[PDB]
RNA sequence: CCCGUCUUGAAACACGGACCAAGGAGUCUGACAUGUGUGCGAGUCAACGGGCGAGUAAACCCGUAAGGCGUAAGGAAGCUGAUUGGUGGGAUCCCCCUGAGGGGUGCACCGCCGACCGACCUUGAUCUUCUGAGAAGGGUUCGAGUGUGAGCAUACCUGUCG
RNA sequence: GCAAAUCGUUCGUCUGACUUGGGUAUAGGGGCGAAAGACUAAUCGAACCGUCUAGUAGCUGGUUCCCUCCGAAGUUUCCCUCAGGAUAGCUGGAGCUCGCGUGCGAGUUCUAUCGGGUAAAGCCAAUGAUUAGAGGCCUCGGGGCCUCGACCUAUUCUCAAACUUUAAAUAGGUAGGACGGCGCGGCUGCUUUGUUGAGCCGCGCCACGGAAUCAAGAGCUCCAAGUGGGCCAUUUUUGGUAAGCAGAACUGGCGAUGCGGGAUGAACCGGAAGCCGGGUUACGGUGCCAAACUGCGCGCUAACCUAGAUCCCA
RNA sequence: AUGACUCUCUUAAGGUAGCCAAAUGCCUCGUCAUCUAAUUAGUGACGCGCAUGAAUGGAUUAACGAGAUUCCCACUGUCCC
RNA sequence: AGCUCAACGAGAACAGAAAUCUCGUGUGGAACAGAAGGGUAAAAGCUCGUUUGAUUCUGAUUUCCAGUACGAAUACGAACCGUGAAAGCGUGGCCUAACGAUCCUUUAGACCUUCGGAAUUCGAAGCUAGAGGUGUCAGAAAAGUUACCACAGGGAUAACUGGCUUGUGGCAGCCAAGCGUUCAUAGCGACGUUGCUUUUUGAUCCUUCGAUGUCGGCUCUUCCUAUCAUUGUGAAGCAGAAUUCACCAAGUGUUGGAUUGUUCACCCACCAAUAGGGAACGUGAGCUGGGUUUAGACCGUCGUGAGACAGGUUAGUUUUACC
RNA sequence: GGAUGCGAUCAUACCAGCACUAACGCACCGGAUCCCAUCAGAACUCCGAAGUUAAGCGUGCUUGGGCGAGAGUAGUACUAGGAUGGGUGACCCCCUGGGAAGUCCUCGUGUUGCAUCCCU
C-alpha cells in the first residue's frame, strides 16, 4: 500500500539542496502599502 | 504521450495511402511541356509565341490593390474607344473578355 | 484535506501549558519586530486567527514582512530533495523574538577591537573561537584516600526500599 | 434558515457605489429558449436516427441546492445575486425568533 | 574496497575540442592551443575555450550593441568569439577595430567605409598575442525562441513559460485554465 | 547443476527448446521538439513554374509588390500598439601596488527594482464634428510583450504522436 | 483401430405414425425440427467461401556484433484507476557558468539558543478504574438502646493506546561576518505631536577571514531512458493463538553481486571485484575427509535414552 | 395428552377434495409395523408438509416398457479359491 | 455594555429529593447547534442595546501538494459600512469537516463588443460574476443470465498434495482441594499450570492454471507405536476366577456379513484379539465408476424472465508404454 | 519607611485563621435637586464632607495548606551504539555513552518601573 523505504537515499543522491540566497529578495507579498512609498523614494532619490 | 510537446494532430487515420501523388514525373512534364510550346511556335508562326495580348488590372481585395496583373482580356467599351471591332480583336491576337466592367 | 485535517494531531502541540491559560501577558504585544529579525514560532491555543500549520510550531524563521497584527516568516522546509523557503504570516501572539544569534553582536565587537589592540603593535593574531582542548599537567595535594569496593550481593535489597 | 425581506448591503453601480436598502427575492432559473445557439445545436444532433446523442445525467446526489438571493438596490433600481449556503427549509420574511 | 563515488574519476562532460570539422577553425584551435600553453595568459584561455563552443553557444553580436560596448574605448582592439551581424536600427558607425569569426556582407561594408578593419583571430594573435588593450564582448546567449519555453512549466503558479502550439488564436489554447470564466486561469 | 524467460525468488516437480542449414523482428513517412554540424543573417528559403542542360529524371540560372517562416504585441471583439535601464554580483583588459590589496573596464548570465505597449481599472487641465482628441497623473491586476533584433534553410541522432 | 464411430455377442421393431430409390421444394439470424439447441456435405447456441484485414489487444512469446564508461526503480499525486497510463523522484547524455583552496559547500561534531509529550514515572495531583482496614461516628437510611451500610477525616493494595502534574535517551529547527560594522549626509506620496520612525540611497572609514573536521570543487539548464508487483534482517511496532501470515516506522541488505566462512542456502558473518607475482589478514579454523597442533595449561562431564559438539539455524 | 369450542391480529383469497419423509421433508438413517441372524435399502402406515395439492392438472388405473427400485424361487466360477 | 456558570452549604407560608426567594463558598467541576480534541471567566458563557464585515474589487500566502486545481483558512491593500465615548473589533458561525471542472442552460452587470455591402429595430452571438452536478465526489449516459458457451492471460488468485502455524482436534505431564467405607496419590485429579502430535478442521496463499487425472472401494507391499491379542514381568481396595494400572516389547496376528457410493457409522456372528495410523488425505497408462462434477430430463423452493439451488432424482465414451 | 494612580513580572504574589498600623492618602460613609440608573439610589450615576478606622487596602504571625528552590530518590527507571554475548524461552549481564520522576527531608513566602504625596 505505501512505504518510505528507500525514499530518504533517493532524496541524498542529489540533495539536500538548499535554494540559491541572493542579496536582494523579491517583494511580492509584502505590504502594498510599504512597498508603494519606497518605490517613491526611490523616484526622488537624488 | 508523454513529455512537453506540441499536441500532435496528423490527419493520417484514413487509407491515406492509397491516395498519395508522387512526383518522379515532374522532369519528365517539364519536357513534356516544352515541346508542346516548341510546336505550338511552329504552328502559330509567325505570330508571337507569348499568345495573345491581356489587359492590365488591378489585383483584388485590399492586400493587393496596389499592384497590377494580366487580365483575362479588354473590354467592350476599351475596344470602342480604341476603335477596335470587338469580332475582329480576337482574329489579331487581341483577348476580349464581354464580362469585364470599367468603373 | 486528503485525510487530515488543518489541525489534526494537535491535541498536545496547541494546548496551552499548565495553569498558563486565560489571560495573555501584555509584554507580548508591546514586543518590536523588524526585518531580517529572528523568531521562533511557538502557537498559542488561545488565539486562533493568524495561527500557523502544526508543522511550523517549533520552527525558528527570519522576518521578511510587517503588518499591523502579523509578521512574515521565512521557514525552511524540506521537501524530498529540496529545501524550500516558505513565507508565512503569522499574528504576533505565536511568535518569540529568539536568541540564537544573541551572541553575534557582542562577539564581532570584541573581535574588531582585539585585532585593533594587535594591528597597532604589529603582531598578527587570530580571534576565531576554539572548542576544550586537552587539560595541562598538574599536581594534585594528597589527602585521605577512600577505598571503594564491590558489594556483597543481597537479594533483600533488589527492591526499591528493599522487600 | 430565514432572511430578512430588506438588507442593506454595497451597491456596485456606478450613481451609488455606497451602502443602500434592497428588497431581497430569491433567484429562480428561467425558462430555456428555443432559439440558443446551444438549444438549435442539440435539435439538429438529435434530428433523424441516431437515438439520443448527448448524456442524460441520472445518479443525482444532492439533496439541497445552493439559493440564490437577488437584492434589487432602490436608488438605482438595479440587481445583485447573493448565493448563500445549501439549506433544505428557506423562507424571506419570515417571523423572526422570539417575536 | 574505497569509499568513493565512480571510483574518485569526474561525471563532468566539457568540450576539449570542437565538435566542427572546419579546417579553417582547427588551425585556429592549434594557434590558440600553443599561445595559451606558452603564455599563461587568461584572455588566451578564455578564446581557446569559446573556439570549441557549438553555435548556439556562439550568438552573433548585433553591430548596434557593437558600438554601443565600444563608445570610449577606440584604441581598443573588440573581440568577438562569433558573428558580427549589420543593423539597420544603427546610423553612425565610428572608425572601430573589430576581430570576429566571420562578419555578415552589410557589417563588413559598413566597419570598412567608417574607416575601420574587420580581422581573423590569427591577425589577433600578431597585434595582441597576450590580448592587450582587447575589448571581449559575447552575444545575447538567451535571446532565442527555444529558451522561451525553458523554465517551470506553462500551467504552474508565477510561469510565464510560452507553450507549444501550433498556431495563434482564441482557440489555441485560451481556454479553461487560461482564465478565471474557464475553471480557473493557472 | 541447463540455457532462454516471467519473477521478491529458477538447477527446479514453472514454461520454450530432439538436431542442422537458410530465412527471421524499432522500419519508412508526416508533424513537432531539444541537441549538434553547415550556409547565410534582419533576413532566409529556386519549393509551383520558367530558362536550360551531361543529346540531358542530374547539374546550372531565374522571386520582377509571389509565397512560407521570421521582423510586434495585447484584446472575445470594436481597436490600440512599445520614451528607447537603474542596480548587486561577474569574464577579460588597463593603471598603481606587489596584500585574500586598491582604482578604471563591466560582455554573457543570474538576482532585485523602475519605465514603455496592450487587456482591465483609473484619471482629464485644454479642445472637439457629442464622442472623440489628451496637459498632468496613475494600478498588490493581467500578457506566450518592449527597453538596439536572431532568425531561416539544411543534415542526422534521440523523444512524443498518427 | 479394419474404421476421424468400426467389430463381436446381446438387444428394439417388423402391414405400419412402416422401409427405401429417383425426381422436386425450403438457404444462413435463414431453412428445417414428433423439440435433442437437433440437423443444414466429418463444420451448427448461427454453416461454408472470398473480401473489409497486416481487424484491435492495458495480455503471452520472441526481439540478431564486441569492448569501454555511467547506472536505477517497485515510491508521490491523478486516472471506471488496482496486470495499465501520466506525473514527480531515482538515471544517462549534452553541455554551459565559474573555481584551484582565499572554497560559503557538508546524511559530522562543537558552541549558543528554541520546539516536543514517546520511554519511564505519577495516582500518597485532575479525569477514569480499583483493594482493604482505621478514626470520627455529626447527620441520613437500614434492620434488630443496639446495630450494618451510607457519610466525613487521615491512610492503604493495584492500574490506563484513545488519562496526566512531571519527564528522558535518540531525533528536529535556527545562528556562528566581507550579503559585516560604524560615521556623516540625502530621498519618501508611508509613519510620528515631532527630519519621530521605517526602508532605501550616496560618500568616507574599519573589517587576519572571525568554532572543529573535510571539501576526487561549486552552480545552472536542456533532452530523454528505465521504474512505479518488491523481498530479507537488527530494533520500534499494529492485527492475529500463531504462521516461511498481513500491515506500518528508521537504517542496512538482497533484487542488479561475484568472492572467503556458516556441510548445503538470494538476505547470516567477513568482504565487495581490471589481468598477474610476492607478502599479510578478515570471518572461520588447525584428529581424518581438508590447508593449519592429536601444541602448551586448569577444571567439569561418563550418558545400560543414538552423551555432547558453535550467531541466523533447523 | 389432545383441542371440537371461544378470543384476537389479518389477506384479493387464507391450500378445499385428495396425496405424502414421494423422482417433492431441511431436520433425517423421522416414528410405528413388516421383510432379515443383522437393513442409512424395500413395502404398508402416521403427518403443523424446511418447501404437497387440483388441465402450472390432483388422486387412481387394466394392458404395455432394451425405463428406476425391493424381495422370493430357479440358476449358476460373481464369490469361497 | 453589564453580569457569572455547574455544584454544594445554611435559611423562607402552602413547598416535599426536586417550583420560587436570600446569603455564603465556588479555576469552570457549566455553557459555547453537531463528533472528538483543543480553547474561553469584568469571556468566546448568560442577559440586554444598536445592527448586517454572511458587503464590493483584485492580488499574495497557508493547508492539500506534482509544490497543479478545488474546498477551507490566514495576512494585507483599495472602497463602502456596522458597533462603541474611544482604542479597537467585524470579509460569516471560538478553532480543527460540512462540498464540485469542460460543454450546455439560466441570471446579474457594463448609454460595452459582433452579426463581416451600408444602416435602424427585434433576435442571436461575446466579455465579467454567480446559479442548475456530477456522493465512483479531478466529474462516461447503462440490467440480467449462461450447466450451450468462446478468447487473451493469470499460479499477481480460489477449488488437491506438500510447506509454515496448531487456535481447534487428538495424546501426555506437574501441583493436590476432594473422591475412594477408613485412607490426597491401588485407581482417580477439581481449581490452575507445562507440553507433545500433524492420522481433524481451520489460518495462510510459498510451489503448480502452454493441466501433478478430483470421492470411495478392490488389489498389493512396506513403515510407525500413542500395545487390541500373543511372549516375559512390576502394582492393586490382586483369596481364587475375572478385571484394572504400569514396564520391556511392533516378532506374529487383527476376520465373515446386513444397510449406505460413501469416509464415518450401526447391528448380527465368529475369534486369542477383532488396536490405532503413515507412505503425494499410498495406490485410475492397476481396475472399478456407485458418488461428485459438462451437455438430456423430472420435482420442490426461488426468480417477471432467461435461469439459480455446499436440495432430491434418473440416463450419461475412463485414451497411450515399444523409451 | 510607606501610601496612592498607572504598571511590569503573573501564587516566593494564592487560600485560611489570628494580630497590628504615626502622617498624608485610600476607604467606608451622608444625600437623591440635576445627568444617569434599576423591582430595588443595593449596584451604577450625580452632589456632598457629619461620622469612623469596624471592614476594605497595608503589614506581621502560623512546627497551616498550596506555591517556589534545594537535597535526596539515583547513576535507580528508561535509553543511543556494540557483541558468532548468556539463556529453551521470557528476559538479562557486560562494553562505548546519555540519564529521569512521586514519597521523605531542609529552606524560602515576592521583586520591581514611572508619577504624585506623606514621614519632613
Ligand atoms: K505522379
Ligand atoms: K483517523
Ligand atoms: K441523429
Ligand atoms: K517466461
Ligand atoms: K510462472
Ligand atoms: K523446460
Ligand atoms: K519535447
Ligand atoms: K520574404
Ligand atoms: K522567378
Ligand atoms: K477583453
Ligand atoms: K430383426
Ligand atoms: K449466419
Ligand atoms: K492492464
Ligand atoms: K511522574
Ligand atoms: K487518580
Ligand atoms: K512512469
Ligand atoms: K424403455
Ligand atoms: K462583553
Ligand atoms: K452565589
Ligand atoms: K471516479
Ligand atoms: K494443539
Ligand atoms: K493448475
Ligand atoms: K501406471
Ligand atoms: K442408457
Ligand atoms: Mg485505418
Ligand atoms: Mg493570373
Ligand atoms: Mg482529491
Ligand atoms: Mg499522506
Ligand atoms: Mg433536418
Ligand atoms: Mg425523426
Ligand atoms: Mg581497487
Ligand atoms: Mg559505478
Ligand atoms: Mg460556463
Ligand atoms: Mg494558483
Ligand atoms: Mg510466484
Ligand atoms: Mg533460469
Ligand atoms: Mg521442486
Ligand atoms: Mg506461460
Ligand atoms: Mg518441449
Ligand atoms: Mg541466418
Ligand atoms: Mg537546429
Ligand atoms: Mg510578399
Ligand atoms: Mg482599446
Ligand atoms: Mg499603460
Ligand atoms: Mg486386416
Ligand atoms: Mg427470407
Ligand atoms: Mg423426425
Ligand atoms: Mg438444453
Ligand atoms: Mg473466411
Ligand atoms: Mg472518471
Ligand atoms: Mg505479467
Ligand atoms: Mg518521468
Ligand atoms: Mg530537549
Ligand atoms: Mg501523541
Ligand atoms: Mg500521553
Ligand atoms: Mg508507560
Ligand atoms: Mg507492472
Ligand atoms: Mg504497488
Ligand atoms: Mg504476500
Ligand atoms: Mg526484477
Ligand atoms: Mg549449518
Ligand atoms: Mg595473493
Ligand atoms: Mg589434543
Ligand atoms: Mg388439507
Ligand atoms: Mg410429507
Ligand atoms: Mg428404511
Ligand atoms: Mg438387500
Ligand atoms: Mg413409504
Ligand atoms: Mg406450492
Ligand atoms: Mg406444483
Ligand atoms: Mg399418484
Ligand atoms: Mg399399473
Ligand atoms: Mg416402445
Ligand atoms: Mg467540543
Ligand atoms: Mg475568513
Ligand atoms: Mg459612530
Ligand atoms: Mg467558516
Ligand atoms: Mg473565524
Ligand atoms: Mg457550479
Ligand atoms: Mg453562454
Ligand atoms: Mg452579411
Ligand atoms: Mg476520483
Ligand atoms: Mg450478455
Ligand atoms: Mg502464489
Ligand atoms: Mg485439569
Ligand atoms: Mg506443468
Ligand atoms: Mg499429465
Ligand atoms: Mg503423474
Ligand atoms: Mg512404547
Ligand atoms: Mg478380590
Ligand atoms: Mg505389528
Ligand atoms: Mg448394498
Ligand atoms: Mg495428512
Ligand atoms: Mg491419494
Ligand atoms: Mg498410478
Ligand atoms: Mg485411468
Ligand atoms: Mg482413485
Ligand atoms: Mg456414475
Ligand atoms: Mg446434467
Ligand atoms: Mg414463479
Ligand atoms: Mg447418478
Ligand atoms: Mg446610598
Ligand atoms: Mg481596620
Ligand atoms: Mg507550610
Ligand atoms: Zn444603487
Keep these: 500500500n505505501h512505504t518510505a523505504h528507500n525514499q530518504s537515499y533517493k532524496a541524498h543522491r542529489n540533495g539536500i539542496k538548499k535554494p540559491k540566497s541572493h542579496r536582494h529578495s523579491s517583494t511580492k507579498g509584502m505590504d502594498p502599502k510599504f512597498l508603494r512609498n519606497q518605490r517613491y523614494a526611490r523616484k526622488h532619490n537624488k | ?103 | 484535506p486528503a485525510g487530515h485535517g488543518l489541525r489534526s494531531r494537535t491535541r498536545d502541540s496547541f494546548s496551552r501549558a499548565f495553569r498558563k491559560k486565560g489571560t495573555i501577558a501584555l509584554s507580548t504585544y508591546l514586543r518590536i519586530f523588524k526585518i531580517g529579525d529572528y523568531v521562533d514560532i511557538k502557537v498559542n491555543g488561545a488565539i486562533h486567527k493568524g495561527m500557523p500549520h502544526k508543522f511550523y510550531h517549533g520552527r525558528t524563521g527570519r522576518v521578511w514582512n510587517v503588518t499591523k497584527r502579523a509578521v512574515g516568516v521565512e521557514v525552511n522546509k524540506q521537501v524530498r530533495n529540496k529545501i524550500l523557503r516558505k513565507r508565512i504570516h503569522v499574528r504576533i501572539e505565536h511568535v518569540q523574538q529568539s536568541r540564537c544569534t544573541e551572541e553575534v553582536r557582542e562577539r564581532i565587537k570584541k573581535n574588531d577591537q582585539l585585532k585593533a589592540d594587535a594591528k597597532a603593535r604589529g603582531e598578527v593574531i587570530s580571534t576565531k573561537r576554539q572548542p576544550l582542548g586537552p587539560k595541562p599537567g598538574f599536581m594534585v595535594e594528597g589527602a585521605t584516600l577512600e577505598t571503594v569496593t564491590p558489594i556483597p550481593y543481597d537479594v533483600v535489597n533488589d527492591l526499591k526500599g528493599g522487600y | ?99 | ?186
Aim: charged residues 30%; proline residues 5%; glycine residues 8%.
Design chain 2, 1 to 103: 504521450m508523454k513529455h512537453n510537446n506540441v499536441i500532435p494532430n496528423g490527419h493520417f487515420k484514413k487509407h491515406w495511402q492509397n491516395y498519395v501523388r508522387t512526383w518522379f514525373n515532374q522532369p519528365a512534364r517539364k519536357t513534356r511541356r516544352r515541346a508542346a510550346r516548341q510546336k505550338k511556335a511552329a504552328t502559330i508562326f509567325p505570330r508571337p509565341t507569348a499568345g495573345s495580348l491581356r489587359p492590365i488590372v488591378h489585383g483584388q481585395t485590399l492586400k493587393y490593390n496596389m499592384k497590377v496583373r494580366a487580365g483575362r482580356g479588354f473590354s467592350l467599351e476599351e475596344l470602342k474607344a480604341a476603335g477596335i471591332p470587338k469580332k475582329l480583336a480576337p482574329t489579331i491576337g487581341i483577348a476580349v473578355d464581354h464580362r469585364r466592367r470599367n468603373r
Design chain 5, 1 to 186: 574496497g574505497i569509499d568513493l563515488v565512480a571510483g574518485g574519476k569526474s561525471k563532468k562532460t566539457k568540450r576539449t575540442a570542437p565538435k566542427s570539422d572546419d579546417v579553417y577553425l582547427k588551425l585556429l584551435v592549434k594557434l590558440y592551443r600553443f599561445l595559451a600553453r606558452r603564455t599563461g595568459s587568461k584572455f588566451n584561455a578564455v578564446i581557446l575555450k569559446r573556439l570549441f563552443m557549438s553555435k548556439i553557444n556562439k550568438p552573433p553580436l548585433s553591430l548596434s550593441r557593437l558600438i554601443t560596448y565600444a563608445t570610449g574605448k577606440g584604441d581598443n582592439i573588440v573581440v568577438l568569439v562569433g558573428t558580427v551581424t549589420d543593423d539597420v536600427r544603427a546610423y553612425e558607425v565610428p572608425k572601430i577595430k573589430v576581430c570576429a569569426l566571420k562578419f555578415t556582407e552589410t557589417a563588413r561594408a559598413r566597419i570598412e567605409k567608417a574607416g575601420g578593419e574587420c580581422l581573423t583571430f590569427d591577425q589577433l594573435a600578431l597585434r595582441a598575442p597576450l590580448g592587450q588593450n582587447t575589448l571581449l564582448l559575447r552575444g545575447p546567449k538567451n535571446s532565442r525562441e527555444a529558451v522561451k519555453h525553458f523554465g517551470p512549466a506553462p500551467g504552474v503558479p508565477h510561469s510565464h513559460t510560452k507553450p507549444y502550439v501550433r498556431a495563434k488564436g482564441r482557440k489555441f489554447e485560451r481556454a479553461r485554465g487560461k482564465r478565471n470564466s474557464r475553471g480557473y486561469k493557472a
Design chain 4, 1 to 99: 434558515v430565514n432572511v430578512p425581506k430588506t438588507k442593506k448591503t454595497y451597491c456596485k453601480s456606478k450613481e451609488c457605489k455606497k451602502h443602500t436598502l434592497h428588497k431581497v427575492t430569491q433567484y429562480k432559473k428561467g425558462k430555456d429558449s428555443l432559439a440558443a445557439q446551444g438549444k438549435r445545436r442539440y435539435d439538429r444532433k438529435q434530428s433523424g436516427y441516431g437515438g439520443q446523442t448527448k448524456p442524460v445525467f441520472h445518479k443525482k446526489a444532492k439533496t439541497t441546492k445552493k439559493i440564490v438571493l437577488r437584492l434589487q438596490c432602490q436608488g438605482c433600481k438595479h440587481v445583485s445575486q447573493h448565493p448563500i449556503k445549501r439549506c433544505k427549509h428557506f423562507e424571506i420574511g419570515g417571523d423572526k425568533k422570539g417575536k
